[PDB]
Design a protein around this ligand. Sequence first.
Ligand SMILES: COCC(=O)CCCC(O)O
Ligand SMILES: COCC(=O)CCCC(O)O
Lengths: 218, 218, 8, 8
Amino acid sequence: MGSMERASLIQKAKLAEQAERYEDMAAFMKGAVEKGEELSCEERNLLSVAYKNVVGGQRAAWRVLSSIEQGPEVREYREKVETELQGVCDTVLGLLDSHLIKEAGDAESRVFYLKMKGDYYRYLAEVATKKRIIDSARSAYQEAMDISKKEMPPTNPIRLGLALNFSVFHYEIANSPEEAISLAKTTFDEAMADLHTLSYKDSTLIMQLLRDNLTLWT
Amino acid sequence: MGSMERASLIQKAKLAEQAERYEDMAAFMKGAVEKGEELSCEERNLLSVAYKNVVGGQRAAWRVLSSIEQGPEVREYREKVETELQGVCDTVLGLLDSHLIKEAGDAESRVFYLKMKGDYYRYLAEVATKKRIIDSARSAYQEAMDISKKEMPPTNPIRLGLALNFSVFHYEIANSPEEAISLAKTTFDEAMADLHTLSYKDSTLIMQLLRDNLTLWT
Amino acid sequence: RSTSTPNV
Amino acid sequence: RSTSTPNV
Ligand SMILES: COCC(=O)CCCC(O)O
Ligand SMILES: COCC(=O)CCCC(O)O
């Protein structure tokens, strides 16, 4: 992508989105990141949509294959999918470390990137057998939580989505169901008290998911 | 794929189907074909399902992009998708020519392969501006029709699917709506008269599509 | 668009 | 399975 203009990469990422070509969309946004300028709010969202779709297809295949596994063929093909999944997560973590996080221009942007870092270590944790990977996920999420509580309102949709995901980490990955429940419940109650200030449609969608999970866990 | 056993390729193609990994499914079946033995009925169907899914995603993207097109970016990205589509159709035609068609063991199998040849020249025709490509599609379909009328019953689902597709060729590609209508109508009437001999569920599904198209065209 | 054989 | 943030 090095010979194509930054503006052209961003335009083609939007075309690939409309066409449902998510592998191409991700390659175009990686090219744009490596140009070295800071991303706008619409550009961060393109980068997130592209990789989440690619890694989402790989996770749903790994789970079908793990379930079949319970002749070396099933184990071989499951390991193949697993290594491609790991390559995608390691490419994203490399972009965030080099140098999106360090160069971010404000709180809103730095929180978005640290949430992404926690999400991609968490996807690595799902297929590992590791304690170190879980410790890296927890630490990225905790740094994002600390900044967001000081710099953004309780209804901001990135603050809310960050709390939802850190809650799922506690319940599904780190075996702390008490911590997941308490976080989800405190998060929902504080956003509820702040609705009157909305902006209002964005927040209520993630609140609903917090409540759904509470019902399941409780 | 040259170092993997034929039985292992076929097993992994079935795993990739369950996991919805159609690009991997196609690579495994190409490996199996290049081992050089004749395919069974279940193996021909795996090969068809894999490539039809890959080329189906590419056709739906090309049509979204052509519609946007109506700055060089849209034209460049549409040409990129178009060349990948052409590479997939040329790989399939190469398998059929080398040597699935020539080595087929009977009528049922030879008709399946000549129908596939007509279908992949037709997909090339949709993006060309060509008369030669249309002449190659028509000729593969006509040879399949001649064999099937002599060797299979009017209700056989490959004979029916072949007639449905040759009808769509006449209407959408070769501008002969009279020929499409007459073929669809003669095909439906002759299968109807033969239902009492079913096997019965397989045929009625393609008959329904013949009727749907007749309603549209008429 | 006309319909062709589906991918069973 | 618990639900995480959807891909807007
Ligand atoms: C860093 O992850 C990005 C994110 O959560 C996108 C926001 C989705 C929400 O509006 O449903
Ligand atoms: C050579 O193309 C193969 C084909 O038509 C598969 C049969 C599908 C039909 O049973 O709905």
